[PDB]
């Protein structure tokens, strides 16, 4: 094939090419001398190609250097970290707000920070207030903190950095604090942007006064994140969502209003909220006969959203056990009682920010 | 083993000093408070190393002065609390009389 020869010939020309060392321009000494620093390496006094612009080589610019002569080939755009890339390109799952029940009050508070200020900036400038930038979703486990984050990421047309705080921790010296810097650098370069940090107590816990070396490295990551949310350089058009079910352990600086402006309490569902969530999860379930959702609600006191889905799941497995293709109210009645027995093994959940 | 006990100032360390003056064996002196370390396992590790030096310099006399100070004094630098001190003691129990064969090491505690 003629096209096959072209692909093989393009391969041969590719083989002759050589990789180029990636660095960063520190200062332009002369019209032909530059000071650059390798990404993880020493600093060199290098030259530059004559064909290069040499005005785009401002200090801090990422550059590619020859392996032998270390001369600058080209200026590269700001590097996006592979971990930060996975944060932006993280599939929420196409979650709609119609899949969240009883959190209409809490949804509106969340959208008042991340939706309206990013679309109508002049509305808030008119009153004389800078819109809140950070929001904390806290509550007992299973109440819908991550689901609300997925719904916001799925529905809101904005740049979104989704990350779990335990997934940023790296054993290398200064890597975890570097990842936070890259997260906000990506957000600053892609305004408007939203950073959702799930399980913030992984790195955002209270700073220890007598901790270990591992703790100190995490606290440096925390206070690096603190410096980005509210520090010397003002964060513009970057909103932050933080979710945790143990906000009592968080640092006071993290919970300070200047950083986490709104503390939205995703509480356990009430009688109406439990009814809403039950219909959400029992909807797709095949059933004959009248289903008294109020009867299940009355025995669902103390349940979260996860239990109400388990009640729907267990009721189906009762039907599977009886070789039934449908679920009756009696199947739900055992399921809600069975789940209620499992709630005795769960310890205290009422934890609030201090 | 031998332990010297009594009211303060009664001559417990003095007799050990007299022992160290007229001994042909290596004399190792460690105050009991020196076995409280700032890190977990270091206290047990130190008791293990102290009798390891005693093994090398056989015959030897190990003087654990103020042995009671390891438990009667609580220091915030000791990460593990009374539980780490107990593990330090359990290492000390093995060294005095344990599985490993003990050479010519005589232990004096005060």
């Amino acid at each position: 094939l003629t096209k096959q020869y072209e692909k093989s010939e393009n391969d041969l020309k590719a083989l002759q090419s050589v990789g180029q060392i990636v660095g960063e321009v520190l200062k332009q000494l002369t019209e032909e001398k530059f000071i650059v620093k390798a990404t993880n390496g020493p600093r060199y006094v290098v030259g530059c190609r004559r064909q290069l612009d040499k005005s785009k080589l401002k200090p801090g610019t990422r550059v590619a250097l020859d392996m032998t002569t270390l001369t600058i080939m080209r200026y590269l755009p700001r590097e996006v970290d592979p971990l930060v890339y996975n944060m932006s390109h993280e599939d929420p799952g196409n979650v709609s707000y119609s899949e969240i029940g009883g959190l209409s009050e809490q949804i509106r508070e969340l959208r008042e920070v991340i939706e309206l200020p990013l679309t109508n900036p002049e509305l808030f400038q008119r009153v004389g207030i800078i819109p809140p930038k950070g929001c904390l979703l806290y509550g007992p486990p299973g109440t819908g903190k991550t689901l609300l984050a997925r719904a916001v990421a799925s529905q809101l047309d904005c740049n979104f950095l989704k990350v779990v705080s335990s997934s940023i921790v790296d054993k290398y010296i200064g890597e975890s604090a570097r990842l936070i810097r890259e997260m906000f650098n990506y957000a600053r370069d892609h305004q408007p942007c939203i950073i959702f940090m799930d399980e913030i107590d992984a790195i955002g816990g209270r700073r220890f006064s007598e901790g270990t070396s591992a703790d100190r490295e995490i606290q440096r990551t925390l206070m690096e994140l603190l410096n980005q949310m509210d520090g010397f350089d003002t964060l513009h058009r970057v909103k932050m969502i933080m979710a945790t079910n143990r906000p009592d352990t968080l640092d006071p600086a993290l919970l300070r209003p200047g950083r986490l402006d709104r503390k939205i309490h995703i509480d356990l569902p009430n009688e109406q909220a439990r009814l809403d969530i039950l219909k959400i999860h029992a909807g797709p379930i095949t059933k004959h006969g009248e289903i008294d959702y109020e009867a299940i609600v009355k025995l669902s006191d103390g349940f979260n959203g996860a239990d109400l889905r388990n009640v729907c799941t267990e009721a189906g497995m009762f039907a599977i056990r009886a070789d039934h293709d449908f679920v009756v109210q009696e199947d739900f009645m055992k399921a809600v009682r069975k789940v209620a027995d499992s709630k005795k093994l769960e310890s205290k959940l009422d934890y609030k920010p201090v | 083993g031998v332990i010297l006990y009594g009211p303060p100032g009664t001559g417990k360390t003095l007799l050990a000093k007299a022992v160290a003056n007229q001994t042909s064996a290596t004399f190792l002196r460690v105050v009991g408070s020196e076995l409280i370390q700032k890190y977990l396992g270091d206290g047990p590790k130190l008791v293990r190393e102290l009798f390891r030096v005693a093994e090398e310099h056989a015959p030897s006399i190990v003087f654990i002065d103020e042995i009671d100070a390891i438990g009667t004094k609580r220091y915030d630098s000791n990460s593990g609390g009374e539980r780490e001190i107990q593990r330090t003691m359990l290492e000390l129990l093995n060294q005095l009389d344990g599985f490993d064969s003990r050479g010519d090491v005589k232990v004096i505690m005060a």
């Binding site: 020869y5 107590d201 591992a214 979260n304 | -």
Partner: protein
């Protein structure tokens, strides 16, 4: 041109010779071009990708590059920790559900949550219900928790990732979280898969607020496991079994009804079960046809499955002690005394 193509491919084989320097793709720029980070901790810019289509590369992709020119020679498989790969069982233990006595309800409650969704996925789609996510087996020691896990691995063709709690507790920060998110990554690629976490309380200890010190590293590993059980990305292809002896220690977010949907209480074996257990572990043993396992079950109140098995093991000890080739009911009777481990007493003045 055929000779030119074949001669061209010969020149590739010289440059494509091993060893390759393992690297990770960092970026894919346009002015078609790639940035890679070598395992020697070096960041390089490649004006041309190499011998791999730029469309088939994504950030974080493991690639093997030329040791000298650092040009991407091939794509590499996804990288999983050797510790995570070493906890995937390949021997597939030879246990059976008939080797477990007195746990029929517990076996049913686990099989219909771990095995039924994998095989009969239609029973859940027609009913419109989501299959249970996570099964926790809790109870007193010796009640047969990891035994059922072995039987689960025995009677299942799915990938099984046996694991213990202390294995996820690592010195370096983020190492344990990497293992947790690598076990689920490896399990996802080998779906259907079952992940068994024995001694869950090693990592699942409840979080707490402290001002001086605490085990935040393990709480970070647990928080990673919470995300893998139920987090931002819903993983509905890896079944998770967990076992613990003290469920009161476990963090409430771990015992959630989305992470561990079914919490099975393993009870102390009752009189019928204890006789069944002693019968289970006496099959390979020359036992005389007069042993009243009903009487032994009555003589072993507050015995777990391990003690009931130990009764059979100690019974052969006494038979060998007296040189018998057959075990008698008396050998079982005072083999109960050994397992009972009652302290020596001169209580002959009673009655």
């Amino acid at each position: 041109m055929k000779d030119k193509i074949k001669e061209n491919s010969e020149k590739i084989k010289v440059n494509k010779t091993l060893p390759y320097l393992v690297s990770n793709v960092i970026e894919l720029l346009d002015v078609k071009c790639a940035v890679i980070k070598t395992s020697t901790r070096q960041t390089y810019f490649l004006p041309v990708i190499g011998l791999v289509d730029a469309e088939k590369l994504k950030p974080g992709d493991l690639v093997g590059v030329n040791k000298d020119s650092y040009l991407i020679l091939e794509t590499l498989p996804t990288e999983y920790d050797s510790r995570v790969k070493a906890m995937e069982v390949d021997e597939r233990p030879t246990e059976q559900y008939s080797d477990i006595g007195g746990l029929d309800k517990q076996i049913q409650e686990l099989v219909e949550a771990i095995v039924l969704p994998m095989n009969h996925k239609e029973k859940f789609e027609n009913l419109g219900i989501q299959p249970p996510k996570g099964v926790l087996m809790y109870g007193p020691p010796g009640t047969g928790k990891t035994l059922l896990a072995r039987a689960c691995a025995a009677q299942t063709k799915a990938t099984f990732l046996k694991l213990a709690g202390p294995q996820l507790v690592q010195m370096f920060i983020g190492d344990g979280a990497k293992l947790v998110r690598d076990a689920f990554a490896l399990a996802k690629e080998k779906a259907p898969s079952i992940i068994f976490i024995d001694e869950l309380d090693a990592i699942g200890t409840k979080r707490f607020d402290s001002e001086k010190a605490g085990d935040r590293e393990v709480q970070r590993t647990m928080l990673e496991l919470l995300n893998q059980l139920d987090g931002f990305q819903p993983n509905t292809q890896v079944k998770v079994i967990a076992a613990t002896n003290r469920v009161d220690i476990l963090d409430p977010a771990l015992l959630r009804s989305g992470r561990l949907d079914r919490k099975i209480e393993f009870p102390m074996p009752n009189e019928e079960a204890r006789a069944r257990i002693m019968q289970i572990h006496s099959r390979k043993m020359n036992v005389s046809p007069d042993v009243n396992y009903e009487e032994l079950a009555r003589c072993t109140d507050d015995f777990n499955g391990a003690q009931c098995k130990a009764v059979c093991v100690e019974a052969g000890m006494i038979a060998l002690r007296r040189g018998a080739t057959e075990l008698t009911h008396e050998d079982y009777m005072e083999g109960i005394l050994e397992v009972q481990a009652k302290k020596k007493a001169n209580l002959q003045y009673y009655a």
